């Protein structure tokens with residue numbers, strides 16, 4: 058009952074692309090424009106942020122072919138660094154990174170599926186929450202029934218949103234090269250070359266490329282984890298970078314920086330401006346995007362928790378697998394329950410302030426772990442070893458990305474450190490002490506409840 | 521000890537009828553709860569009320585306007601040309617305006633009508649091509665440009681009183697010529713001086729509307745009574761009519777309340793233009809302690825607010841000695857007026873005021889930011905309710921965007937804002953405690969939701985309270 062490697066190259070490309078291109082390019086490509094205030098330098102910052110994210114993705118290709126173990130930030134931290142920081146990553150990704158991520162993506166799905174019915178005002182909060190919870194439950198059931206159903210949902214919907222972004226880019230280039238070329242005549246004017254603006258420009262050009270390693274969270278289920286993973290990342294990164302640059306070319310050709318910077322739904326404003334009829338195509342597109350980019354944070358997180366239960370940190374339950382269909386049911390139910398719990402909170406969009414120092418700290422610490430491996434143990438079987446230039450420059454970039462939310466948002470990021478650190482009690486009280494030394498009553502009730510949910514969830518431990 | 525049951529049990533003790541029936545029941549209860557979540561979503565989507573339609577306003581609603589009464593007196597000597605002004609479009613867009621009005625740039629000498637035409641650029645200001653480059657740079661920086669077509673702008677009579685038919689022809693062909701050139705509107709002044717005002721002005725309106733629907737024609741009259749306003753505004757309804765209808769005010773709260781409310785009830789809550797005159801400044805009719813008060817009202821009345829050049833700093837035409845009243849000079853820096861230097865203070869130039877939040881230019885920038893970006897001010901409905909003896913209190917609410925409330929102290933003593941309304945619709949439910957975006961007088965902190973009962977209004981203090989969509 059091993060996890061039954063059933064992911065192809067196209068499915069890996071679909072996961073990565075489907076995890077990067079989300080609501081981060083349709084509702085707010087302003088984080089760069091608001092701190093650059095021009096077109097040419099904004100496109101250059103997009104290109105350069107993309108180049109740095111590509112160097113990072115190549116770092117992770119090297120990693121995910123060296124270790125070949127799921128999680129990509131809980132096994133890579135685990136090996137060569139030890140149990141402690143591994144469990145710290147798993148804790149912050151169980152409390153306020155994966156639940157908040159999926160809850161926000163589902164809430165944006167709800168907001169932009171009914172937006173064509175509620176254009177100018179605020180949709181009823183009740184409908185937002187109920188429809189987002191229904192979307193999460195449907196995606197958890199899909200990913201439970203058959204892993205192939207999850208891969209097919211992800212593939213279909215990343216096809217849909219890539220077609221929508223192709224439509225945007227094509228309309229932008231048509232308007233550009235038809236007769237107008239109106240804003241791209243004296244670009245770079247009014248820009249700000251003082252580091253106090255280009256810093257935040259790049260730092261918000263990186264939060265738009267986050268998600269280029271969803272495929273490394275499930276390295277173990279890939280067909281040929283030594284060839285399909287790096288080839289899949291190398292087929293994804295250029296596609297996402299080119300789509301980002303050309304989509305912003307479309308926006309800046311049709312719309313004006315000001316309105317863009319004002320459009321809470323920049324792509325919706327673009328639809329209203331250029332799509333005379335069929336203005337309800339881009340809201341549908343953002344809805345399909347948030348759906349196919351939720352099934353990439355449920356087909357990649359519920360494997361993180363899986364590796365978690367496998368190494369001994371989380372109860373052995375989350376390691377089970379359905380006998381007849383080979384899908385990690387209990388991990389999926391744990392992730393669905395986490396997301397639905399973190400849907401009760403009003404305004405979860407603020408929780409992007411508590412992990413914007415934890416997520417990138419842990420990506421950077423995985424990179425530091427790769428460098429630690431390269432130095433200490435250079436005799437590993439490495440089916441590809443890229444030049445240390447890539448890990449070192451991406452480590453410097455991640456030092457940038459984890460110091461920026463430490464200068465500003467300092468109280469928030471320190472509460473995020475408090476959240477991540479809150480796991481150390483569970484670690485030093487229940488995890489570190491070995492079996493036969495933990496209390497008999499708690500272990501007995503865990504045995505009873507594991508037997509219960511294992512008989513109910515219809516799952517078994519890996520063999 | 522114990523361990524997860526082997527698949528063997530998963531095959532014997534789990535496949536028992538009881539456990540499989542329980543599992544089927546759990547799954548079916550799940551899908552019942554999920555069809556229930558869908559039913560809830562789909563029913564609550566038809567429970568919240570529909571979303572009102574945006575009136576799809578033109579450009580001249582999306583922000584204030586702005587006049588350049590004379591190109592030369594705006595920046596100063598030497599650079600008093602269109603190409604020189606082309607740099608100031610980085611300054612103007614800091615004020616966050618969505619308009620502009622150049623002065624009459626056609627060649628005009630004096631009463632002589634046979635030589636003065638409305639097409640030839642007066643060469644002392646520049647040429648055609650620099651003008652087109654100015655227009656293109658403006659367009660690029662989201663600032664539409666208007667143009668003044670008052671023919672006899674150098675002379676007492678402005679319409680060439682001798683003749684009326686051929687000047688109409690000059691205006692006729694100049695409209696279409698400059699519109700092909702790329703101007704985004706037109707204005708004329710002293711329409712009460714032009715005989716056959718209503719009909720000729722309606723004809724020019726038809727011209728500028730036939731060329732496009734995002735063009736503008738603004739007529740300015742020195743009138744001060746509402747009756748003249750209506751009598752000229754019967755056949756023309758797309759005509760922002762800037763007049764001295766307000767400037768005659770004695771700054772009495774009840775007087776200005778009656779005045780604005782009567783103007784709106786006479787035009788039936790149409791779209792109007794709020795200014796004190798056709799080209800005069802604010803300070804030419806208002807004391808300096810009253811200016812913040814007015815500029816808080818003009819940026820919140822349901823219309824397009826129309827300021828002359830220099831009324832974003834409080835430029836006075838009488839404070840600086842030896843200054844021409846009709847066309848003062850803007851005060852950029854200490855070197856703005858090289859004559860009798862040293863008297864130019866630091867709080868009187870745009871430079872020294874641009875950094876102080878408790879200045880007047882800061883008030884202008886924050887207001888014109890709250891105007892050109894917030895829905896409920898751009899086109900929201902306007903409803904005034906009574907208040908204390910000498911106050912001015914109203915509410916701006918569109919559908920569900922941030923609902924604004926304004927109150928203004930038109931008195932020289934400490935007034936009390938009673939704020940009893942009892943008459944606004946249910947979509948205008950007053951909160952007992954309301955926010956505060958800014959105040960004409962520094963001393964009340966912004967971001968403090970203040971209760972709507974105990975309010976003591978110091979002399980000439982304005983209030984821009986805010987609250988979200990309440991039910």
Ligand SMILES: NC(=[NH2+])NCCC[C@H](N)C(=O)O
Nearest residue numbers: 076077079081265267268271
């Ligand atoms: N597994 C993940 N990294 N999930 C997060 C995906 C979010 C992605 N940065 C986006 O642009 O929406």
